[PDB]
Amino acid sequence: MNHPVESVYSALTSILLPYMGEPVPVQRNCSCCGRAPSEFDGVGFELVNAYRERVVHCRPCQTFFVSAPELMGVENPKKPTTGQKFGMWSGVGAVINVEDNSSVLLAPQGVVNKLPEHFFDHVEVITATSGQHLEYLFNTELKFPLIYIQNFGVKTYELVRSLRVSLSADAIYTCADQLLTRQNEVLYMLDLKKAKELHQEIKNYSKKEMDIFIRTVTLLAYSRITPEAASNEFKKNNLIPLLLLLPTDPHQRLSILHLLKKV
Amino acid sequence: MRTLNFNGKISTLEPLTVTVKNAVSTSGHRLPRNGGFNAAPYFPGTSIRGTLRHAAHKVIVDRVGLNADGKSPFDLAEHFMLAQGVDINGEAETFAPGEINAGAELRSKNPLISLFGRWGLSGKVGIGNAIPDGDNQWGMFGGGARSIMFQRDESLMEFLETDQVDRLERLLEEQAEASVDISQIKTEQDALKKAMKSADKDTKAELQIKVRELDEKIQARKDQKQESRESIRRPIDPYEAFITGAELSHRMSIKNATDEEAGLFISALIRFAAEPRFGGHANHNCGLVEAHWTVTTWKPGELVPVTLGEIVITPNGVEITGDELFAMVKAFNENQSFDFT
Amino acid sequence: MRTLNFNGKISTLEPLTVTVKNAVSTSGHRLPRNGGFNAAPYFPGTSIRGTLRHAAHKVIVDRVGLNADGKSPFDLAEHFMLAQGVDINGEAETFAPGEINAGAELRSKNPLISLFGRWGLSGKVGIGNAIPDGDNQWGMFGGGARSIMF
Amino acid sequence: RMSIKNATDEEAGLFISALIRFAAEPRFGGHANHNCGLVEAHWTVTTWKPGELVPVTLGEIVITPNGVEITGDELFAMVKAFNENQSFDFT
Amino acid sequence: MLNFKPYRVIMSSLTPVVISGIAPSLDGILYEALSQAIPSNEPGVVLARLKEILLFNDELGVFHASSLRFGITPEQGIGATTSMRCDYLSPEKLSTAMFSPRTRRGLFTRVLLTGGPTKRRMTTRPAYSAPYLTFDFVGSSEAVEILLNHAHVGVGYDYFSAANGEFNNVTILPLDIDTSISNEGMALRPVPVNSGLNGIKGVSPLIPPYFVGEKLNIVHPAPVRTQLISSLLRG
DNA sequence: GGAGGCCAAGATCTCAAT
Ligand SMILES: [Zn+2]
């Protein structure tokens, strides 16, 4: 119910509800999401993965493992009858508007080509590679709260446990197939508001000065130049006002720079 | 129930090296560093922990022995539980997250899992890094250069027949031609790279596109080669390592060590001494070390260390000093309740 | 199945030199150093390993036999595999990771490739560097000058 | 220092035979035009059974310009095991 | 319960530090050190002893022990590194001398290493590399010196297994003002939200061990804070 | 005849360098 996967299901992956089949009464947790059975109403899907494991899935988690070739195309011609799955879509992202219950797929050109005509009536698809996600997030007037899936990936279980709802532009949680522990949550948070502020204030400086700033912050973040040398460079090119906008965290600095260089 | 702190040194009889993904750049191979290229390196405690966990696993395998048919009594699931700590079939006990002192029965029956934990059970053995003492105790060892065995020793040509000599000549010619062609492609790629920074934002894409296409042209050129896909003559890249005779400070601990778990750890260190090497590049006999640890504990009721003994590992043997350590080893050897399955 | 450790010394009868690509500079020819520019030199374990590997290769070549013409049964590929440890035809029995007892049969049948190994097969032999015992046991040799003989 | 990890009798015998053949031309390195590289070496062979506290010396290999000296019955046993095993396929 | 004076501890960082969302606090390190010294894991006992060497603020329910603050020199500043942990399945581990694999046609079924339950785990975490690590506290300098020097504790996450946050050269120098909880109205450690202190909001326990107990709404400083080592030594 | 096991296939691309 009140789980991030339900929001993804309703907004995006309820399209293949007709092909799911009927559930079975189950007595164990959903290994995919781990939530208690009390939010399943006792029904779930029994599945065997290629590793020969008996995993129980709720309805929202099952949509990542459902093959509907007539709806989602086919990903590998060697296996004609197995369609593209949300649980196997490497390189495909999605921005999900929870309140409006609408979703926006960010698929690359190859995946878009593989998609049949019937797909586009149900899901709005944007042609954008993995590197072009940042452009879409930057330019689009985002509606919050939203779930932004950066990469559906192949490791569904870790994607499902890592789904988080972004309440504001301060903290957009980029969700991928990598497990979101508290030790690596700095890599999967994007300070869009501060990046946009820095981009707005980066326009006052020259292109050469901007490149110097980006290279100096990147080298300093990787312990490649001494702080004294970086400070001398910043003073020389008058980049001190820019430096005060960056977070002290080097990983946040690198995320913000990666966003600036893409937009 | 006491904490056993192992403080000591590790002296490298041979260069000591380790390959870590984030420390090995494309510019060269480097040891792990806590900072830039001017920082002093260290030998990861993860590598030492893995080596000692394998030694403890070998101790357990030797102790348990082999079945009547001669096959090891551990299946794949138990093997990965003892070795990597993962449970592959989902049959492991899942303790409640609230408590800390969990798995008391499992810790009592399986000393290896108690020392080195599994997923869901914290391990009592902490193994720290090997921090160097000096300031110039690392250097770029290895290196060398692969040669052609027939261009170096002419007596080897007498063994080859005429067809094989012709094949060798074709191989050398192909190697030279491919070297020249690939050098030209790399030159063009580098020319693209130099103007890449000066390139405009729109041009940032297709320059990378041509670099990519140049890369697969190199791959296709090497695929066109028939006698050999790889040039036999090539410079070998050196690896960074700690020099011979480097002194590295090492700290190890066992938290709440029973006599049996500490005995298993001492036995692992004893068995580790038969082949006492960390790290890789064993082809150059790298990694061989000698270490001496001062086993100490905490005085009950106050913050005062108490020395229990000392473990010295040398090429000439293992010296265990201290009656307490022998008591731990004997307690491990005499226990008849352990079940590692 | 035992571990044998060869601990000993190498005594020098004639000057011992080696040209390592990363050790020599434009300033001059230098021996590889035991870490740093001012440390004691050493003789690389790579050179000793290569010399002993080729010696073992010739042991194998002599043991297999030479025909009346003095030719060995091994083609070019076998010679390269046994001495250089490189395969040219691409027929080396690549062991996918996860194989249980990966080199068992190859090691049992080919003691040379078991000792010294190849890519994908760890060699059992590790031959370390040679470290001098004292100081100032190295110096600049060679020298001289070519001259018009007339 | 040299070592063979988990060496059978046959592989140790091959290594010892390599050392014996190396003694005929005990040359390391380059600049052989000045006869650089001649060496004489002696190695003490020891084995260490895991689980025990001390190693045991098997013998000694001495390479000198006057000959090759190998001591200890274990090294001779290794060489004989290599020279008398006919199940080796090197191709 | 003793004559507790405010101290600042500065240690040299030897290994990159992995921060579990909330910056490590010195009371956590001292709790681990005392859990090793006292051969007991009971939180009640360790906390009862920890209060003898760290001042406990009853009003807020937190120890006078500041969180981590990286000390940067002009030679080296706060850097970005990853903590790499991998499964090394050596030929010894994949051998029949250790386990008996399942057999088909006499051949041994290979371990599927690219994925599954038996995959090589390439677990990587963000880490921070700075020359110095600095904590502020009010307590017995002798006991904290002994615990930091002799116990098996690091600064950060999972020092026991990975040896992240290894440190040495622990230097303790007395302070003039207690800067362990508050400084100019900004919280320097996880404090209750009702304390009136400013900082990043979050959910965490107030006393160690921080992985055990009900998680209240707290206010904590930024996880990665840096201060110049010259300004730290000023005292 | 599942049932074990292998092997090939699936999107596009990652700048830090004494
Ligand atoms: Zn679920």
Residue numbers in the entry:
A (entry chain G): 1 to 263
B (entry chain A): 1 to 341
C (entry chain B): 1 to 150
D (entry chain B): 251 to 341
E (entry chain F): 1 to 235
Task: Give the authors' words.
Type IV-A CRISPR-Cas systems diverge from this general mechanism, using a nuclease-independent interference pathway to suppress gene expression for gene regulation and plasmid competition. Here, we present several cryo-EM structures of two evolutionary distant type IV-A1 and type IV-A3 complexes (from Pseudomonas oleovorans and Klebsiella pneumoniae, respectively) bound to cognate DNA targets with and without DinG. The structures reveal multisubunit DNA-surveillance complexes that intimately recognize their DNA-targets to form an R-loop structure. Our results support a model in which DNA-binding is achieved analogously to type I Cascade, while recruitment of DinG differs mechanistically, even in closely related subtypes.
Cryo-EM structure determination of the resulting complexes revealed the effector complexes at average resolutions of ~3.0 Å (type IV-A1) and ~2.9 Å (type IV-A3). Five Cas7 subunits assemble a helical filament along the crRNA spine in type IV-A1, while six subunits form the Cas7-backbone in type IV-A3. However, in type IV-A3, a more pronounced arginine rich loop (RRL; arginines 102, 104, 105 and 110), extending from the Cas5 thumb, inserts into the minor groove of the PAM-adjacent dsDNA. For PAM sequence recognition, Cas8 aligns a loop emanating from its Znf to the minor groove to identify the PAM base pair in position 2, with lysine 79 probing dT2 of the TS. While type IV-A1 stacks a wedge residue onto the PAM base pair in position 0, type IV-A3 Cas8 positions valine 154 and methionine 88 in the minor groove adjacent to the base pair in position 0. Lysine 155 of Cas8 and lysine 119 of Cas5 clamp in place the rotated phosphate that connects the PAM and dG1 of the TS, which together bend the TS for sequence interrogation. Similar to type IV-A1, the structure of type IV-A3 revealed a cryo-EM density corresponding to the NTS (through nucleotide position 8) atop the C-terminal domain of Cas8. Different from type IV-A1, we found α-helices 8 and 9, originating from the thumb domain of Cas7.1, extending from the back of the type IV-A3 effector complex to interlock with the CTD of Cas8. This NTS-interaction mode fully encloses the NTS in a positively charged channel.
